[PDB]
Structures are given as structure tokens and as C-alpha cells.
Amino acid sequence: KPKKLRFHPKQLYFSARQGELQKVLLMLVDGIDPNFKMEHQNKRSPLHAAAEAGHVDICHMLVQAGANIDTCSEDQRTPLMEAAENNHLEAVKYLIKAGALVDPKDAEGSTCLHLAAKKGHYEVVQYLLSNGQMDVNCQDDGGWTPMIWATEYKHVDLVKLLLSKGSDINIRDNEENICLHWAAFSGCVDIAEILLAAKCDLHAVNIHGDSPLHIAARENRYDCVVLFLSRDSDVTLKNKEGETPLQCASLNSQVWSALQMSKALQDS
């Protein structure tokens, strides 16, 4: 039973993280369980660290040793999600081609597609939609789609990629917002333009009665406000509290100056 060269269980996780291929090889040969879970470190397996860092050589060695490709951390994350969120395409490709499940959702109901969309990783999203049977309109616990996340973080070519692969411009979230309300929130005039060309309703309202113009004025997104005014968005429409988009704007601001002008000019 006594071994001259002894390893600590935690050493396999950190060596997978650092991409020390020869150290992982030696530990796996010494019969260290590749399916170990880090107790005081969000119950993650070394396959999570190897995937998070993008080490395809290490990832493969762990799977060949017998690691579970679909292991979950405390926050119900899979290594496929860790590689997708940290933009490691060849690790994403390795895990999908090994048999990693694309379908799992984390604690927030996010899939690897949501997590790569959120961060603007075009390359990963492109692979997940092409060499994957992944739902373009999957919704998380807020009822948000990968497009909504991509829109909010202003990832224009990513929104365009999802649009071209069947993303529905009319999906409603749990607060009754469509993607256009999030383009108005983020202040993305490029995305807001693309959605309007796709003949999106400029007067769609959420659970608060807010039109994209209410949201753009509140978030002080002048460029969006101007786009919506040029598309003849209603300056009079009152939300649920009874406020017009002008009543949502910041006092003595560029948005305020434009909205107070539009109101006086439409009067007659």
C-alpha cells in the first residue's frame, strides 16, 4: 500500500487548470479518480477546469481515464458550458464529438448557447447552431433567449447570426418584453434597426406598459430615441404608471431636449 510518489486529490484539478499535460498523465496513471469533486470549490470536477481553460489534450486524457463528460458543479454547470462561456471552440468541438449533452440548463436555466451568446462568442454560437441540435429560441428562468442576451450586450453580428438561423423576433420574456425592448435598453441602434426592418412592432409594450421609446428615453439612449422618433413612434402613449416617454427622460438632458421638441411640434 505505501507509495513513494503520492498525490493530493486537489492537485489533479489545478494541473488540469494550468494545462500541465505531463502532471495530469502521471496522476491519472497513479489511479487518482478523474471524477473527483472539489468540496470547498463549487463541487467542480477537473474536467470543468480543463474545459474552462480550453485544454483539449487534458480534456481528452480525462475522458480516456473515465471522467463523466456531463458532470455538474453546485450551480448545475457542465464542462461543455464552461468551454462555451470562455470561448474554447476546439474544446466545445471535442466535448460535443465525445457525446457531451447540449440540452442541460444551469441554476438560472441557461444552456451553453445562452452563455456563449451573453459573452458575444460568435465562433462558438456558429458551431452550436451548425454541428448541433440546439434550440435557437431556448428560454432561461427570466424567459430570455440567446438573442435577447446578445442584444443587451450589443453583439451585432451575433444577433444577425441568430436571426439567420431561425431566432424568433416575437418571443416574449416573463416581463412581456420582446428583443426590441432590450435593444432600446442597451442603446443598440444597429440591432434596433435590424429588428424594425424585420417588421417588428415599434409600439409593442411590456408588463409595465413601456414601449421601446419609454425604455430608450429612461435609459438615456439618444441614438435609439432619434431612430424611434424617425419611425413615428407615439410620443403620447402612457405606460401603466401613466407616464409618457418624455416623463421617463432625465431632466435637462439631450433625450429630454429632443422629446420636449417632438411634443411641442406635433401639438399642431
Q: Which of 203, 199, 208 is nearest to 176 (CA)?
A: 208
The string of DSSP codes covering 222-259 is HHHHHHHHHTT--SS---SSS--HHHHSPTTSHHHHHH
Residue 160 in contact with residue 136, Cβ under 8 Å?
no
Place of cell 489511479: 31
43 CB contacts (<8 Å, ≥6 apart)? 37, 72, 73, 74
Resolution (angstroms) equals 2.3
What does the radius of gyration of the chain's CA atoms come to, in whole angstroms?
A: 24
Residue 142 in contact with residue 113, Cβ under 8 Å?
no
How far, in Å, CA of 4 to CA of 220, rounded?
A: 66
- Please state, as a whole number, how many other Cβ atoms lie within 10 Å of the Cβ of residue 186: 21
Is residue 142 classed as helix, strand or coil in its secondary structure? coil
- Please state, as a whole number, how many other Cβ atoms lie within 10 Å of the Cβ of residue 244: 18
Cα angle for residues 72, 128, 176 (degrees, 5° grid)? 80
Alpha carbon dihedral 222, 224, 230, 236, in 10-degree steps, equals -80
At 69, the amino acid letter reads I
Q: Which of 218, 204, 209 is nearest to 259 (CA)?
A: 218
At 47, the amino acid letter reads L
The string of DSSP codes covering 156-205 is HHHHHHHHHTT--TT---TTS--HHHHHHHHT-HHHHHHHHHTT--TT--
- DSSP single-letter state for residue 53: H
| C-alpha grid cell, residue 242 | 401613466
How far, in Å, CA of 159 to CA of 93, rounded?
A: 22
Q: Which domains does the chain have, with CATH numbers?
A: 1-101 (1.25.40.20), 105-168 (1.25.40.20), 179-268 (1.25.40.20)
CA distances, 139 to each of 65, 107, 149 (Å): 35, 13, 10
Is residue 263 classed as helix, strand or coil in its secondary structure? helix
Q: Which of 156, 96, 66 is nearest to 111 (CA)?
A: 96
Q: Which of 63, 58, 56, 146 is nearest to 100 (CA)?
A: 63
Q: Which of 54, 53, 60, 4 is nearest to 34 (CA)?
A: 60
How far, in Å, CA of 146 to CA of 115, rounded?
A: 8
12 CB contacts (<8 Å, ≥6 apart)? 24, 27, 28, 32, 34, 36, 46
| C-alpha grid cell, residue 141 | 428562468
- Name the method of structure determination: X-ray
